[PDB]
Design a protein around this ligand. Sequence first.
Ligand SMILES: Nc1nc2c(ncn2[C@@H]2O[C@H](COP(=O)(O)OP(=O)(O)O)[C@@H](O)[C@H]2O)c(=O)[nH]1
Ligand SMILES: *C/C=C(\C)CC/C=C(\C)CCC=C(C)C
Lengths: 173, 150
Amino acid sequence: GTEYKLVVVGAGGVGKSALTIQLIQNHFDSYRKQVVIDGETCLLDILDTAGQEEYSAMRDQYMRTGEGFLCVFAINNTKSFEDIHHYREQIKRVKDSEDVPMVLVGNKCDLPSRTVDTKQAQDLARSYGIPFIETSAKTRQGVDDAFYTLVREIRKHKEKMSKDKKKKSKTKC
Amino acid sequence: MSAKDERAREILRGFKLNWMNLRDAETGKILWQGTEDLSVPGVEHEARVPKKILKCKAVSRELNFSSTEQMEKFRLEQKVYFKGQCLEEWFFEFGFVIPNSTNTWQSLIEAAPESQMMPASVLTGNVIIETKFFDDDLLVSTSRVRLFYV
Ligand SMILES: Nc1nc2c(ncn2[C@@H]2O[C@H](COP(=O)(O)OP(=O)(O)O)[C@@H](O)[C@H]2O)c(=O)[nH]1
Ligand SMILES: *C/C=C(\C)CC/C=C(\C)CCC=C(C)C
């Protein structure tokens, strides 16, 4: 049993709570949920930051303890897409690390009034080197894929760290 | 370059290596103590150390240095060459240096596994240690020592 601390961030109203509820209770404030991913039973500790983001100590704490982050924007809200880099830069500074497991999520992909092109979201994620996934919390499209992909990102990072022969000296000099 | 070339020159102007020891880590016995200042760039220094240091499980190296200039991240990079082939690469960090202070710096150096040990008679006179003296990312000096095991 491996536990994973997942944190959902993004501008108000992009659908962080709806995504979390869809993953947890399968229908359209941290919560511990047992899930089978790639045949391995995982405990997911999922934090929807909608309530805590405005409190500095709270934000700093969930950025410190979060192991992976879903960075969510809404595909009909350009300003939420533009906010993404503020969340990524905050997390990175708090964690003092350029390699934080992260997935870019474009939510509300059920809406036809799209203002953020998939290609520009894909470009942002490529520049970060992270996956990009489109979701609808309304229809559940991509929901599991987004959270499971983030778990896989954490697993890859953790496997890296636990592999990175302490060296000794033939000369004593 | 020139803005930090001058900073590097100021630090080096006020820097002195006072002495260097090698002690057995287990017993604390001084095995070698250095006379000639080995940090001075531009010349190939020589050092004759007892061959028994190679038999130590670990040695403690002590450097005593003075610095008129403050340093935020005093550190050394050392490359150990055997007949010109890089044998070892080491990084040592001291950290913050108070202006006009005199400091003892201790580093623990463990032996390689016995199956990878090289004989003194093969190493002696064929080892060069190149030391780069930095203050964070600022290269202050480069110096070289040729090692004999006597
Ligand atoms: N059409 C559509 N609406 C959504 C979707 N996700 C969330 N919403 C709606 O957008 C509003 C904000 O959702 P919420 O989860 O409260 O966003 P949060 O503030 O980021 O938690 C709510 O009225 C949701 O019903 C989606 O995928 N599609
Ligand atoms: C066993 C190692 C020997 C004898 C020489 C080690 C060299 C140094 C330590 C370099 C001293 C240089 C500075 C303090 C800048």
